[PDB]
Design an enzyme around this catalytic site. Structure first.
Site, PDB file in Angstrom:
ATOM      1  N   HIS A  46       0.833  -1.219   0.000  1.00 54.53           N
ATOM      2  CA  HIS A  46       0.000   0.000   0.000  1.00 54.53           C
ATOM      3  C   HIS A  46       0.857   1.254   0.000  1.00 54.53           C
ATOM      4  CE1 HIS A  46      -2.080  -2.960   2.723  1.00 54.53           C
ATOM      5  NE2 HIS A  46      -2.829  -3.002   1.597  1.00 54.53           N
ATOM      6  N   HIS A  48       0.800   4.651   1.861  1.00 47.39           N
ATOM      7  CA  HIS A  48       0.271   5.245   3.106  1.00 47.39           C
ATOM      8  C   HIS A  48       0.385   6.763   3.007  1.00 47.39           C
ATOM      9  CE1 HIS A  48      -0.161   1.641   5.857  1.00 47.39           C
ATOM     10  NE2 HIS A  48       0.307   1.110   4.734  1.00 47.39           N
ATOM     11  N   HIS A  63      -3.717   4.223   5.028  1.00 48.85           N
ATOM     12  CA  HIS A  63      -3.655   4.171   3.558  1.00 48.85           C
ATOM     13  C   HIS A  63      -3.925   5.549   2.990  1.00 48.85           C
ATOM     14  CE1 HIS A  63      -4.585  -0.407   3.704  1.00 48.85           C
ATOM     15  NE2 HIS A  63      -3.450  -0.084   4.330  1.00 48.85           N
ATOM     16  N   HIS A  71     -11.573   0.727   1.964  1.00 46.09           N
ATOM     17  CA  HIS A  71     -10.466  -0.124   1.485  1.00 46.09           C
ATOM     18  C   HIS A  71     -11.000  -1.126   0.461  1.00 46.09           C
ATOM     19  CE1 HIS A  71      -6.611  -2.206   1.568  1.00 46.09           C
ATOM     20  NE2 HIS A  71      -7.302  -3.354   1.674  1.00 46.09           N
ATOM     21  N   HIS A  80      -9.074   2.770  -1.624  1.00 46.82           N
ATOM     22  CA  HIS A  80      -8.153   3.881  -1.387  1.00 46.82           C
ATOM     23  C   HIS A  80      -7.270   4.064  -2.626  1.00 46.82           C
ATOM     24  CE1 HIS A  80      -8.586   2.320   3.009  1.00 46.82           C
ATOM     25  NE2 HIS A  80      -9.535   3.233   2.754  1.00 46.82           N
ATOM     26  N   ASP A  83      -4.312   1.663  -2.512  1.00 47.41           N
ATOM     27  CA  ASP A  83      -4.557   0.197  -2.410  1.00 47.41           C
ATOM     28  C   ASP A  83      -3.956  -0.539  -3.603  1.00 47.41           C
ATOM     29  OD1 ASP A  83      -5.802   0.489   0.003  1.00 47.41           O
ATOM     30  OD2 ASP A  83      -7.844   0.415  -0.746  1.00 47.41           O
ATOM     31  N   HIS A 120       3.469  -5.272   4.058  1.00 45.46           N
ATOM     32  CA  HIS A 120       2.838  -5.733   5.318  1.00 45.46           C
ATOM     33  C   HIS A 120       3.151  -7.195   5.652  1.00 45.46           C
ATOM     34  CE1 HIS A 120       0.301  -2.232   6.531  1.00 45.46           C
ATOM     35  NE2 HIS A 120       0.500  -1.890   5.265  1.00 45.46           N
ATOM     36  N   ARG A 143       3.840  -3.591   9.734  1.00 49.11           N
ATOM     37  CA  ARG A 143       4.581  -2.969   8.614  1.00 49.11           C
ATOM     38  C   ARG A 143       5.998  -3.521   8.621  1.00 49.11           C
ATOM     39  NH1 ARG A 143       1.722   3.070   8.981  1.00 49.11           N
ATOM     40  NH2 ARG A 143      -0.328   2.124   9.259  1.00 49.11           N
TER      41      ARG A 143
END
Ligand SMILES: *[Se]c1ccccc1C(=O)NCc1ccc(OC)cc1
Ligand SMILES: COc1ccc(CNC(=O)c2ccccc2[SeH])cc1
Ligand SMILES: [Zn+2]
Ligand SMILES: [Zn+2]
Ligand SMILES: [Zn+2]
Ligand SMILES: [Zn+2]
Lengths: 153, 153
Positions: A46, A48, A63, A71, A80, A83, A120, A143
């Protein structure tokens, strides 16, 4: 025409280099590179909101969501801007990233420059999981590595 | 407003956190924070063109110079946009950074977001050093630590 780059680093072994290229205005963005040190399988991937790595990847916030949507996966209307779904690591712990996305941009309000790219701990359920966190984070967990997205030559 | 931030890391022990804030569009930018692991004296302090850390701080390329000028000090008409002069480390090897600049911006054009901030090995001569290199790099030498400049909350 426009090239942007991200070096992923974290507190453990996960590290990678991700390149972004956009031939035309508001065109698709090609995303490519490699991440190593992963557990085999899917890892949420993602953009962020903050290019803030002051206290590591946690400082990057949620995000990137300039359009205040829920999401989803990269192939969903309800997503998002940040995404980008999952990258998949093989048994060697290597994910070879090769993504084309039409929602992220390298110009304008969809621009990801100066934001953070995060890989992630867990799979992103692309908003289709059994709970409320699914349509916020995709349940992709902690993360592992991140970097600020920068202008490339 | 606009707030942006930079985490400085390198191949050695120098590390820092630099904050930028601009209350008004195209107004002055306040620069503050701390860098540790430095030698006593001046250390050149510049925004470089590329937010690319692929092979370390070398990947950031030359000073950020969108207007094709010669190297200077921050108070000169004749400067690169990225020319923020020197930070000064105490005998304790700590520079407490406190700069206000009207040439760098976080908006409009002259924008430093997605570029690299670098702290250098030597003093920057602000283009007054008496060789050709003075008018390009200020003879500030190698890149001790750097980071990509990101969007903050
Ligand atoms: Se796009 C974006 C997003 C956040 C902050 C600034 C920018 C931006 O457009 N900066 C100017 C820019 C962007 C990319 C390149 O690459 C050639 C040059 C200039
Ligand atoms: C949240 O901080 C932000 C500050 C600026 C922008 C948009 N800025 C640009 O796209 C741009 C384009 C060309 C030259 C300079 C800039 Se700053 C987004 C977020
Ligand atoms: Zn995430
Ligand atoms: Zn999301
Ligand atoms: Zn420099
Ligand atoms: Zn310069």
């Amino acid at each position: 025409a426009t090239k942007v780059v991200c070096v992923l680093k974290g507190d453990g072994p996960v590290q990678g280099i991700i390149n972004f290229e956009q031939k035309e205005s508001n065109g698709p963005v090609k995303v490519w590179g490699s991440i190593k040190g992963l557990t085999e399988g899917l890892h949420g991937f993602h953009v962020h909101e903050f290019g803030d790595n002051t206290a590591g990847c946690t400082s990057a916030g949620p995000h990137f969501n300039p359009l205040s949507r829920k999401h989803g996966g990269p192939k969903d209307e309800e997503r998002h801007v940040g995404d980008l779904g999952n990258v998949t690591a093989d048994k060697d712990g290597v994910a070879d990233v090769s993504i084309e996305d039409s929602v992220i941009s390298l110009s304008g309000d969809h621009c990801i420059i100066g934001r953070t790219l995060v890989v992630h701990e867990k799979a992103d359920d692309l908003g289709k999981g059994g709970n409320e966190e699914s349509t916020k984070t995709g349940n992709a967990g902690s993360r592992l590595a991140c970097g600020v997205i920068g202008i490339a030559q």
